[PDB]
Design a protein around this nucleic acid. Structure first.
Ligand SMILES: [Zn+2]
Ligand SMILES: [Zn+2]
Lengths: 836, 114, 61
RNA sequence: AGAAGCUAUU
RNA sequence: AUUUUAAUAGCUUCU
């Protein structure tokens, strides 16, 4: 009945579920190739396989279940296990998905043979997914126009691009690491000294994608623009799985300083950017300058080479070396107790049984294995090959969200450091802090180091450390400390654009907008805007920082650098992208005295983490809308304007090669009207036309579940997502705050109030012993009262008593201190008044 | 003066760490190069004269480093010292199924290149 | 009054770090697990036995 | 009424 | 051994 189809027609064009002698002459012309079989036709086609794996729904995954059993991927009783499809809970699903990768590979080879026969017979046509079998056999060659033999040109844009995410999900190219490309034969023992693999990359390209009508660059340093980088880097992630893992990373060259042999890094072999080479190398040198000596102490080339080999069975990641003679462990202290506050709280009618407010937030003690287990969570980071046609259209629409800011490069004297005395990273922390390096290396040295970064590559080590913070869950959390060498270059490159976003008001990205003085009301009014049938559908990202694909991280970094069209050349811009990948995406992480390899994901210490998170947040939200519009049947829409949008959206995706600046404007206007966003890093609140979503014209919660499955390798449950139908009460939760409508004079204004248990937990437990005496530090409880004041407006009487308890405890501290302003209940009323 | 002291602090580390490199392999492998370009990941895999193995449990220990000599990275390794998570020397007799619950995992195994 | 058990456990376990109990890694992990399970307990009755058990470990010296 | 420094809170 | 971003309160001096 309902089968997956890939249709382009007069008016209807989409990838949805539509219920279902010329060709005989064509059949004679194309009979020679073994690919052409309609006998031996599998109940399911390659379109059904790619449809189920792209639009995945719990309880409606019957098609995905029947295919897995039919092709002996697993037994039927595997499904009885609860949450089998969840990657995080059930990692064994990857082994089940990887068992039909060889069936995918045989389909790729049979496609080239079919294309070869169609070229030799002088035939022009377009390849679609629904014309194949799961075996790989081809049929459905009707709308093919004859021409002279030897000049036929296949069109393979729709077939290949849709099929791209399945190649890495099923691990189709695993057979290419075996001798003679046969699974039964042993592995290939590549030479340990090989790092080029350029010839095999072209052979891999020429065997699987022979007619991809675009020049492939094995090394991205030879690309033309940033849209070429995304195209060529996408193919590399599929070809980097074949080669041994020891080939990637920095490349070391022997150089001499004062006649003393030395080991430095003069290049880098990225899994995405191919192999690049530095341009300023000195075989023989002399007395080293500060900038040159600083670079020599930051690269992992000599740190790893002077250590000893390490074999760690705890972690499934890549171990490089062990700089220390033995592994080091560290534990976490439990939180301290404010007995005076607790005794006062229990006296004032609190903490009785049967009370709606209790104590739930604590500090949790951790053991030594917590640090390495949290690092081991990077096993959720998997090589993801994205749809490149979708990514090329989406990046333009996402970029239009960022066209109201001013960016560009700044000199070293236009840089603002928020907090100097934090850390300098590894190995710089052994000698000083970030203050030492800023005030020692001069203004001219800083610009030269930025200039040197535009013509070379700098790899760098970033340390990992633990966190001592309050939380309900006992999960450990780790924070990455980036080095001072990588921070200065990124500041001069991005601070102009980052400061502008934190200063712009009334935009989609709401970073830097305060919640005080009516800020909460203004942002909530902006997102409501002019939506016809408002509804709220905030969501959450499962395992955001560990499961981020590297393709979306590279795409986000290019958008942030789209503002350098004047100050930097294209050669200078590529060497900036190369630095970012070698210092954030994949790098050596010092996780407990031993060097490892970071497969990917975000780093806490990266300056642009929050802003790049917003770009990725918009990217998934934009992607979810285009998938919803294309998955909708084009013959059920009634609005003629949307149907033209739904038809031209397909054309701008697959049948085009240049940016269509006109349809991007229409699509951006369409989103701004019906899908209003409020974006702050991972958190997001959306006001959407409920009538459109019920018809399928905009993204829903289900559309986010499907996109997250194939573009993030994570499974989103219905627990952390929410939906509200009446705007009188605002978002169910945004940044861990609730909202309600209260009277203020003659005005109704939204107010943010936190969790009552969280506020009490902060007062009871402090992570420092010196904070026990509140007489010296009264300001801690004053700040908590400011956060907790809106609780007095709650209908629940037990909720309002938290502020009075906080307010009463403030008075009790003032008795020993001696003024009335802190105890004044109108001091906390001014912070939520529009007059600043 | 702040830039002067930090200059001497890190330039010595570049010179006092060249010496720490294993001289019996310094000439043996660091001197050897195919075309002056070699990946960095493989440098410790063949130049290091010392190996450290961290073992989570008994099942992994018997499957990887059973006996006094074990083969890994296409080379024979001779065990030198075994130390538990408490930083205490452990003799090879104690590692068995019977004494597995009494052991303080993880275990640190140190080898030496043949 | 259920939270009174959790507050007592928090101060009780912090005493062990003061007396330098971290030398015994296996013992340290055992008391951490018991303390964490107390904090995550849903029924008040279950937390009573672990609190006494945790108190006994302190009294072992 | 604005700068700048430190501390604390979310 | 303790990272990045943004918001606020307090206090300290400068005119
Ligand atoms: Zn290119
Ligand atoms: Zn620039």
């Amino acid at each position: 009945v309902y089968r997956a189809f890939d249709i382009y027609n007069d008016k209807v064009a989409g990838f949805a579920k539509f219920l279902k002698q010329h060709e005989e002459t064509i059949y004679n012309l194309l009979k020679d190739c073994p690919a052409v079989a309609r006998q031996r036709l599998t109940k399911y086609t390659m379109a059904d396989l790619v449809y189920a794996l792209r639009h995945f729904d719990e309880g409606n995954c019957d098609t995905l279940k029947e295919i897995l059993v039919t092709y002996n991927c697993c037994d039927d009783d595997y499904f009885n296990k609860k949450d089998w499809y969840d990657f995080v809970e059930n990692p064994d699903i990857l082994r089940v998905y990887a068992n039909l990768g060889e069936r995918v590979r045989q389909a790729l080879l049979k496609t080239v043979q079919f294309c070869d026969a169609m070229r030799n017979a002088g035939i022009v046509g377009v390849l679609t997914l629904d014309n194949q079998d799961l075996n790989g056999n081809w049929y459905d060659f009707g709308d093919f126009i004859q021409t002279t033999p030897g000049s036929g040109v296949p069109v393979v844009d729709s077939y290949y691009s849709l099929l791209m995410p399945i190649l890495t999900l099923t691990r189709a190219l695993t057979a290419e690491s075996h001798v003679d490309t046969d699974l039964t034969k042993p592995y290939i023992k590549w030479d340990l000294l090989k790092y080029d693999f350029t010839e095999e990359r072209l052979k891999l390209f020429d065997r699987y994608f022979k007619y991809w009508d675009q020049t492939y660059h094995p090394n991205c340093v030879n690309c033309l623009d940033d849209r070429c980088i995304l195209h060529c880097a996408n193919f590399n992630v599929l070809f980097s799985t074949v080669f041994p893992p020891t080939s990637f990373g920095p490349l070391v060259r022997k150089i001499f300083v004062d006649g003393v042999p030395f080991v430095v890094s003069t290049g880098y072999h990225f899994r995405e950017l191919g192999v690049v080479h530095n341009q300023d190398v000195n075989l023989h040198s002399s007395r080293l300058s500060f900038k040159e000596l600083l670079v020599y102490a930051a690269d992992p080339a000599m740190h790893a080479a002077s250590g000893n080999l390490l074999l760690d069975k705890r972690t499934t990641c890549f171990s490089v070396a062990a700089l220390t003679n033995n592994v080091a462990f560290q534990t976490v202290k439990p939180g301290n107790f404010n007995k005076d506050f607790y005794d006062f709280a229990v006296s004032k009618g609190f903490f009785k049984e049967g009370s709606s407010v209790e104590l739930k937030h604590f500090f949790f003690a951790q053991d030594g294995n917590a640090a390495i287990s949290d690092y081991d969570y990077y096993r959720y980071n998997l090589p993801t090959m994205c749809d490149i046609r979708q990514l090329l259209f989406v990046v333009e629409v996402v970029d239009k969200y960022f066209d109201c800011y001013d960016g560009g490069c700044i000199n070293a004297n236009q840089v603002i450091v928020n907090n100097l005395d934090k850390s300098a990273g590894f190995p710089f922390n052994k000698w000083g802090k970030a203050r030492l390096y800023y005030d020692s290396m001069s203004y001219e040295d800083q610009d030269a180091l930025f200039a040197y970064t535009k013509r070379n590559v700098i790899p760098t080590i970033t340390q990992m450390n633990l966190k001592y913070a309050i939380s309900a869950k006992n999960r450990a959390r780790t924070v990455a400390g980036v080095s001072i060498c990588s921070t200065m270059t990124n500041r001069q490159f991005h601070q102009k654009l980052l400061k502008s976003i934190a200063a712009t008001r009334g935009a989609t990205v709401v970073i830097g907008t305060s919640k005080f003085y009516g800020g909460w009301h203004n942002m909530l009014k902006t997102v409501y805007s002019d939506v016809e049938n408002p509804h709220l559908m905030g969501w959450d990202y499962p395992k955001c920082d560990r499961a981020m694909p590297n393709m979306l991280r590279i795409m986000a970094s290019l958008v942030l650098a789209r503002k350098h069209t004047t100050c930097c050349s294209l050669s200078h811009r590529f060497y900036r992208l190369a630095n970012e990948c070698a210092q954030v995406l994949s790098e050596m992480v010092m996780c407990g005295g031993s060097l490892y390899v970071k497969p990917g994901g975000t780093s806490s210490g990266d300056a642009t983490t929050a802003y790049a998170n917003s770009v990725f947040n918009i990217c998934q939200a934009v992607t979810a809308n285009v998938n919803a519009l294309l998955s909708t049947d084009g013959n059920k829409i009634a609005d003629k304007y949307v149907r033209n949008l739904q038809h031209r959206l397909y054309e701008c995706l697959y049948r085009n090669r240049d940016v269509d600046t006109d349809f991007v404007n229409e699509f951006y206007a369409y989103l701004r009207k019906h899908f209003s966003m409020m974006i702050l890093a991972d958190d997001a609140v959306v006001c959407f036309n409920s009538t459109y979503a019920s018809q399928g014209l905009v993204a829903s919660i289900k559309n986010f579940k499907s996109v997250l499955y194939y573009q993030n390798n994570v499974f989103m449950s219905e627990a952390k997502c929410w939906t509200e139908t009446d705007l009188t009460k605002g978002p169910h939760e945004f940044c861990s705050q609730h909202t309600m409508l209260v009277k203020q004079g003659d005005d109704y204004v939204y107010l943010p109030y936190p969790d009552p248990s969280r506020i009490l937990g902060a007062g009871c437990f402090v992570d420092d012993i010196v904070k026990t005496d509140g007489t010296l530090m009264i300001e801690r409880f004053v700040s908590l009262a400011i956060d907790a004041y809106p609780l007095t407006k709650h209908p629940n009487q037990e909720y309002a008593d938290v502020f009075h308890l906080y307010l009463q405890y403030i008075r009790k501290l003032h008795d020993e201190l001696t003024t009335s302003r802190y105890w004044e209940p109108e001091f906390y009323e001014a912070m939520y008044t529009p007059h600043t | 003066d702040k830039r002067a002291k930090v200059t001497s602090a890190m330039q010595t580390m570049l010179f006092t760490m060249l010496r720490k490199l294993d001289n019996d392999a310094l000439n043996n492998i660091i001197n050897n190069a195919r075309d002056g370009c070699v990946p960095l990941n493989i440098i410790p895999l063949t130049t290091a004269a010392k190996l450290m193995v961290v073992i989570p449990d008994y099942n992994t220990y018997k499957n990887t480093c059973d006996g006094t000599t074990f083969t890994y990275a296409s080379a024979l390794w001779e065990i030198q010292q075994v130390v538990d998570a408490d930083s205490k020397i452990v003799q090879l007799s104690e590692i068995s199924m019977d004494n597995s619950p009494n052991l303080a995992w993880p275990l640190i195994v140190t080898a030496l290149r043949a | 009054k259920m939270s009174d058990v959790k507050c007592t456990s928090v101060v009780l376990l912090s005493v062990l770090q003061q007396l330098r109990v971290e030398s015994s890694s296996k013992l340290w992990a055992q008391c951490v697990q018991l303390h964490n399970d107390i904090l995550l307990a849903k029924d008040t009755t279950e937390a009573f036995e672990k609190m006494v058990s945790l108190l006994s470990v302190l009294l072992s010296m």
